[model samples]
Target: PADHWGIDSINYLVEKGAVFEPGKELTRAEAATMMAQILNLPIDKDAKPSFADSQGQWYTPFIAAVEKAGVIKGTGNGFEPNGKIDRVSMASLLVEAYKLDTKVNGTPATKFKDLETLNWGKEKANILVELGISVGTGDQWEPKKTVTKAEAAQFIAKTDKQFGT
Candidate 1:
């Protein structure tokens, strides 16, 4: 399976695909343009023109759209662009992005003995497993591993493919 795409990684994919004009590594301008082009959204005249992690008071309208669509969101008020995301968070994000309605149909009663009955992610986690997005590294779903940038890109790519983006 392919990995997810995010920020620089996605830009790199675009670069590799010749989606952007060849030059230096992609900048926020190139990424924003490609995002608009690929997602088929209108560029905002009033859109603050800057990347999400650029050192300016700019808002990333494209990323905001992804977040609004429940595909991506910053860790908190700000996106720790370089920090690692955990397994559980990744699970939740993919579950939402794929629009899996576990709450309605409920997953199997108890397939994994380690997972608790009342645990919130049981059904969602099962769905992830069924989709082959994740299978805990070991016997357990250590939901707190630091998700590296590269891994995040892979995850996003996989989810994007599954979600028909």
Candidate 2:
């Protein structure tokens, strides 16, 4: 069903700056709404999915999928989708999408001073770097930066390519 759609469906959003990444300001509701469109899912009026929120919300299903699939986690009961995505979190998401696991080798050292702090996703980030999927700006990963729409698109495209889609 999604195959029938032209690249315009996704590319148009990217062109309009819908794919969000770290260091860029965005709202969880906004990101979820864009992600739903990219995934060909229905638009969610309330993009922020929360366990305590009323049922039948638009983001409920999307949140369920991302969480169940281990691609994302909530800050307590809330998805906080609009919050900034950190370097570690972004690396983990990308690695999961790329299917990079314990067996994969890390990226060549970029001599980044703070790479050591990535603890959980350092290996994954290295892999991303090795594949040229992501390049760190300057000497740090800026792990705490808010993600921008365009950056999100680039990251998703990189992961999609890894799966040969």
Candidate 3:
């Protein structure tokens, strides 16, 4: 048995060409690549470079693909490709990329102790939770926490399963 949590998901993502260094924080570029893979977003080989730092970077194609799909926007002219991705940011990206409908009938209480009903990421988080795409850390969502590679894999795998992709 895989002793670690989300090991299966991580393995699956690795097999699908999503690279992750164990014990390292997943970067925004890596996150974008994984998201693109999960969503089957086509990479535009002829895409004009948008981010100055991504001109010749390895993940530029993936970033451009996601941007073309309207999933992520840069912080001004820079994409912050090397920055670490947090849980809320991950939720936002996934929700946007997958076009997940965040609308709900009424005020839905979050299971996470740290997430408020009106929190900015509440709807995105709720959609992720409802689709079984991500399970928060214990009883808290820790929305600002930096996401790990394993967690990213779990999110992608679960979303893939939910969408039958």
Top candidate when judged by lDDT against the true structure: 3
Ten residues in sequence with the least summed lDDT for candidate 2: 1-10
TM-score of 3: 0.81
Ranking by TM-score: 3, 2, 1
Evaluated against the true structure, the overall lDDT of model 2 is 0.55
Candidate 1, residue 84: Cα displacement in angstroms equals 3.6
lDDT by residue (10-129, candidate 3, tens digit) is 777667765435567999888998887777778776674477877677788889898888888886668888989988889888778766664344545577767774447787787777
lDDT of 3: 0.76
For all candidates in order, the CA lDDT equals 0.49, 0.55, 0.76
The backbone clash count of each candidate, in order, is 7, 14, 0
lDDT by residue for model 2 (83-147), tens = 66655566666566446664356445645667777545566677767766676778887656666
Off by over 4 Å in 3: 102-107, 117-119
State TM-scores per candidate.
0.52, 0.62, 0.81
Instruction: Indicate the residue-level lDDT of 73 in model 2.
Output: 57
Clashes of 3: 0
Ranking by lDDT: 3, 2, 1
